[PDB]
Amino acid sequence: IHMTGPMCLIENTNGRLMANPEALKILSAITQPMVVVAIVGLYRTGKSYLMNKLAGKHTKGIWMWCVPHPKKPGHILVLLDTEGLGDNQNDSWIFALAVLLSSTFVYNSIGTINQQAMDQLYYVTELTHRIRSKSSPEVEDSADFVSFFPDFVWTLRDFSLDLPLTPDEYLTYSLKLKKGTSQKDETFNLPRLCIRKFFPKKKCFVFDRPDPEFVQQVADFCSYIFSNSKTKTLSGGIQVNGPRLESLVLTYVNAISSGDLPCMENAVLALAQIENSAAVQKAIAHYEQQMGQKVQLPTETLQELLDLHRDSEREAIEVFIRSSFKDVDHLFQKELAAQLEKKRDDFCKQNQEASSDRCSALLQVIFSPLEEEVKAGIYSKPGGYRLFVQKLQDLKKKYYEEPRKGIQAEEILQTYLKSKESMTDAILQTDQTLTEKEKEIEVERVKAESAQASAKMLQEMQRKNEQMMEQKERSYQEHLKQLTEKMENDRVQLLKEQERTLALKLQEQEQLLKEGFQKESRIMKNEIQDLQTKMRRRKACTIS
Ligand SMILES: *C/C=C(\C)CC/C=C(\C)CCC=C(C)C
């Protein structure tokens, strides 16, 4: 994707914030990961020039300009521009939204970092009231800000002043706090503490008055943005692309419209709702496909059908596990298991009925010649019983010899062989070539054969009774095995992010202590203690 000019992403019309549904349409189509650079500043600050230079070349709100990334292959550079800041009831909301949506946050101001510049940057002192970190109900929620806030860049335009001092050390010294307790001191320290604690990284660029040395001060700012601005990522390594950014815009803007707080965790869970249900359908579609191309529905045994389900079920779970995240209480995985169980019971009852048709059909083919040779009285005769017993067994052999009958072959036949039991005993009793005590022996031999066969059917209806419950356990163990490995990867990734956060907090805490601010160091030490406790957490399995 390569838009020629910026399009309004969020409009500030009527005191309302609305996401331009056209802008979301373009976002949904972008599949590549995104580096989101937000350029923020009061109106007529010169942001439009940085916006055009990063791209490679109204009415209030946030404007978006997505061009391909110049120095990262296969990535999209998303430029966000705040239009109309300081002209005012939604100004602070636009500042907050630019923090939530960007991976690098560029604040642009004119002149130097004095009292007027800090007063104009009053939005940072309201982020505690505009942004929420955690969804769930003694440290502040804003202590989590540093773990997902963007890098901070403060560009100073028309910086007519001599630094020896680097632009970065100028920022560092400017953010040093004042000692004292009067409120001009607390007013002085509040935006500086906010910048130092909420953003993981700080950078400063100074620009002369606009020129070939204004052009390569700009060119070095762009190259720093191109080399150092990271992919927009949500907690858990989720790389934000088009549809995922659209998810964020909608969640945050709808939360503001409702009078609620845009909450980073709520946005992640709302996005997980979308992709997890899509993961379930992708999992099912893979199951149906690998199954329809692997089962021919007179299965020889039941275990042949259960093994095809088991192997198809394993891959479907693999599909879902790969495409899912934040499956709180495993609701979507349990939903996938329910649908896979429903599919398994449908393949089974269609399996047995394809067998109860292949065999019931071949009874009318094999045994109806004999059935109507009995009709014409062909066996009603001296010696007719032995001729009948012999031909019935030849037919029974021809029945067992047919290729693939299924799991119903014995039940269908033994039901028919007893359908004609009295018809056979009539042939036996009227045969005049047989002893009447040899008639005795044969009535015993037949009812022993019937009782033996009628017991092995009940023995098989038990073996299949228990193959089903047995496979129900491997299914469960397969879900358990794959979820366990998924939950460990997520924990290892969450721990990697928390160690990074722990290092940034420890660095800022003792820096505060070194500068002599025991109160602020004490607060940060509690944030560290709260974070180290959280790092020891392990998510549980919802079994019942
Ligand atoms: C550690 C996780 C456990 C013990 C739960 C794993 C089970 C599911 C997820 C549910 C899927 C399995 C069935 C519905 C039988």
Numbering used by the authors: 5 to 61, 74 to 103, 109 to 158, 164 to 189, 195 to 241, 259 to 592
Can you quote the paper on this entry?
GBP1 is farnesylated at Cys589, and this modification is important for its localization to the Golgi apparatus and recruitment by various pathogens. We subsequently determined the crystal structure of GBP1F. Interpretable electron density is present for the farnesyl group, as well as the entire C-terminal tail of GBP1. The farnesyl group is accommodated in a pocket formed by His378, Gln381, Lys382, Ala385 from the α9 helix and Tyr524, His527, Leu528, Leu531 from the α12 helix. In a way, the GBP1F structure likely reflects GBP1 at its most tense state. A bending of the α7 helix is forced in this conformation.
GBP1 contains an N-terminal large GTPase (LG) domain and a C-terminal helical region, which can be further divided into a middle domain (MD) that contains the α7-α11 helices and a GTPase effector domain (GED) that consists of the α12-α13 helices. The GED folds back and interacts with LG and MD, which is important to maintain GBP1 at the resting state. Recent studies have discovered that IpaH9.8 ubiquitinates and degrades a subset of GBPs, which is important for S. flexneri to suppress host defense and replicate in the cells.
